[PDB]
């Protein structure tokens, strides 16, 4: 008596179509209750959609799933994916027994929806400390979503992974990564060189 779903992680471009597969095995009862739960980043688990009648479909946040009795499935689909859809998705099975409800979850699929940056200007900047001077920080920002930031190889250098910032005044989105070190002879112009950075990346003189 279980649930199987796409392993993932599933990385996809903004506005693209999306299918998350879910197959269920219900040995206890013929037709159980069907659910999709969603865990948004840094939020609590919540009901996305449900189908408590076999053969029917459920809809929410542009997502739809059909309780298909013949294929024993509850595939999640959305035609145009958005950045805020990035979360962990869980297919679940609800069967009642012994007078008490019971709920079996799938492993969970992590969906990562990459925003499309329309006018990217990849740049590496040096930022100075507001108070003291102990180290210096570098910021690689405004690069396109296809670019991946590789982790540090030298144990004295710290390079974070990219994260997507959204200014709520205009619909301005931007990727960025931070790099720092106290190790002497560390330059911002070399900080991110172990990554495959765009050939047009702007390296100003600090």
């Amino acid at each position: 008596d279980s649930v199987t779903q796409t392993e993932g992680p599933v990385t996809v471009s903004e506005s693209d179509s999306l299918i998350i597969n879910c197959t269920y095995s219900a040995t206890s009862i013929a037709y159980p209750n069907f659910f999709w739960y969603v865990r948004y980043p840094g939020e609590g688990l919540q009901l996305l959609l449900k189908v408590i009648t076999a053969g029917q479909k459920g809809s929410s946040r542009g997502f739809e799933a059909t309780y298909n009795k013949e294929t024993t499935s509850f595939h999640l689909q959305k035609a145009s994916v958005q950045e805020s859809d990035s979360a962990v998705y869980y297919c679940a099975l609800g069967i009642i027994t012994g007078n008490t409800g019971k709920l079996i979850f799938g492993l969970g699929t992590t969906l990562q929806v990459q925003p499309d940056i329309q006018n990217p200007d990849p740049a590496v900047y040096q930022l100075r400390d507001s108070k003291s001077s102990d180290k210096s920080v570098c910021l690689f920002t405004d690069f396109d979503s296809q670019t991946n930031v590789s982790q540090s190889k030298d144990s004295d250098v710290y390079i974070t992974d990219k994260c997507v910032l959204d200014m709520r005044s205009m619909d301005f989105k931007s990727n960025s990564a931070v790099a720092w070190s106290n190790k002497s002879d560390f330059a911002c112009a070399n900080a991110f060189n172990n990554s495959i950075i765009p050939e047009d990346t702007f390296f100003p003189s600090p």
């Binding site: 159980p32 209750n33 659910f35 739960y37 980043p41 939020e43 609590g44 688990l45 919540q46 009901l47 449900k50 962990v88 869980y90 679940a92 609800g94 069967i95 009642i96 012994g98 008490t100 409800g101 019971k102 709920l103 979850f105 492993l107 969970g108 992590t110 200007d121 740049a123 900047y125 040096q126 930022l127 100075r128 400390d129 507001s130 108070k131 210096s136 920080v137 910021l139 920002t141 405004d142 982790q151 144990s155 710290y158 974070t160 992974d161 994260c163 997507v164 910032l165 959204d166 200014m167 709520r168 005044s169 931007s174 960025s176 931070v178 720092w180 702007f202 100003p204 003189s205 600090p206």
Partner: protein, 243 residues
């Protein structure tokens, strides 16, 4: 919303771990679940009114729990095993179900059990002012906040502009960075950015504060060491606009 407290728990090997939960107002059925690193939920116990319905076999993990009448629900592990370091979820349902249809989940409690509490360390917080080269190039200014050398990875980072908490223009690394990735319990680093407009940064009347809430040791806990007791605290770094 269902309420779970504490959000984060740090405890020594063998010390007890008490966790509370407030189900929604007229919800009698309450569920406890253990979420592991691999995003996998494991049922632990469910109480309907004051009475336990079903509980898992206690051979591998021993714990207490209670949902008293006008008292919040609680889960209690009495002997801390590093095997029980997990996110513990509390869920409530009206009783009806549907099965999970009426299952409403809490935010969880990330418990971390350590053999040596002398590894617990609070963060150091710094703020790095935006690059003049960034401002001249794009007319935007990005502030970076660095919370370094903390342990365990139980932090909540927030930005404050002129004493008010801000959400627009903020990006915080979804997960921390191990300062020393080859070590087992290396201390952690977290970065955050706040991008404002160049004019907003250039106004020296504007105050930017990065706040880091560290989750550590309770006052009712044994500390004899040289360094200051790594208690639950707020560590901050600030900067003013620069014209």
């Amino acid at each position: 919303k269902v309420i779970q407290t504490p959000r984060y728990l740090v405890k020594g090997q063998g010390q007890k771990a008490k966790m509370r939960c407030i189900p929604e107002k007229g919800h009698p059925v309450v569920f406890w679940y253990q979420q592991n690193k691999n995003n996998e939920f494991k049922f632990l116990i469910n109480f309907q009114n004051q009475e336990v319905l079903q509980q898992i076999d206690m051979t591998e993990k021993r714990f207490s729990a209670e949902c008293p009448s006008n008292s919040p629900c609680s889960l209690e592990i009495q002997s801390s095993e590093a095997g029980d370091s997990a996110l513990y979820l509390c869920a409530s349902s009206p009783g009806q179900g549907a099965a999970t249809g009426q299952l409403y989940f809490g935010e969880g409690s990330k418990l971390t059990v350590l053999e040596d509490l002398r590894n617990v360390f609070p963060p150091e917080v710094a703020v790095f002012e935006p690059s003049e080269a960034e401002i001249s190039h794009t007319q935007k200014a990005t502030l970076v906040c660095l919370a370094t050398g903390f342990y365990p990875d139980h932090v909540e980072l927030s930005w404050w502009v002129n004493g008010k908490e801000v959400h627009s223009g903020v990006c915080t690394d979804p997960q921390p960075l191990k300062e020393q990735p080859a070590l087992n319990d290396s201390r952690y680093a977290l970065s955050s950015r706040l991008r404002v407009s160049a004019t907003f940064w250039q106004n020296p009347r504007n105050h930017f504060r990065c706040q880091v809430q560290f989750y550590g040791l309770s006052e009712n806990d044994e500390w004899t060491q040289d360094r200051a007791k790594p208690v639950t605290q707020i560590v901050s770094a600030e900067a003013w606009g620069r014209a």
